Amino acid sequence: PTSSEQIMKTGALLLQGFIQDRAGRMGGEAPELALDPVPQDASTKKLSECLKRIGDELDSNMELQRMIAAVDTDSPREVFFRVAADMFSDGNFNWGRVVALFYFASKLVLKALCTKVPELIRTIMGATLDFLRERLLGWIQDQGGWDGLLSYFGTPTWQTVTIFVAGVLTASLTIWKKM
């Protein structure tokens, strides 16, 4: 539950489930994912549904979409890390930054699927989970695991929470664009 193995596993399945959902929206079963889909249990599915709803709102943030559409790199891992390290360089973590990270990593993977480069999939997911372990694992264990993500976004004005999620990601992309 709060074990490092469960926290890593849930992070992997959350990232996978979000990518697979967007993959299916664009191409049904056609996209070559190159990671085996894992059936999700009841608790993890609730987290995946939360991330799905936040992802849809982030998709409708114009400034953020402009910034993400502006990344066109042969090395998505390098921009992923620049954004990840900047976002968490302040040392004041909360679930909105975690969500923004998983959202941005998923978009990087989707641009690889959409360009028929399935090896970037494992590279980006590997980097995301490595970053999860090195930077975020201690804080998530302190929170009691992933369940608190659900509390964070469980309010009627979750869209106002999501302004700050989009905001922190836009700020780190602006940093990377000036690097």
Three-state DSSP at 10 gives helix
Question: 82: domain range?
Answer: 4-178
d(CA 61, CA 63): 6
Give me the number of domains the chain comprises. Answer: 1
Hey, how many other C-beta atoms are within 10 angstroms of the C-beta on 73? 11
170 token code pair: 């836009």
At a CB cut-off of 8 Å and minimum separation 6, what does 112 contact? 76, 118, 120, 121, 124
Hey, how many other C-beta atoms are within 10 angstroms of the C-beta on 129? 17
177 token code pair: 């664009």
d(CA 7, CA 9): 5
d(CA 155, CA 162): 11
d(CA 50, CA 152): 10
Resolution (A): 2.0
Amino acid at 159: Q
Where residue 165 sits, what CATH number does that domain have? 1.10.437.10
d(CA 129, CA 109): 14
At a CB cut-off of 8 Å and minimum separation 6, what does 158 contact? 53, 54, 57
Cα dist. 117→30, 106, 173 in Å? 14, 14, 23
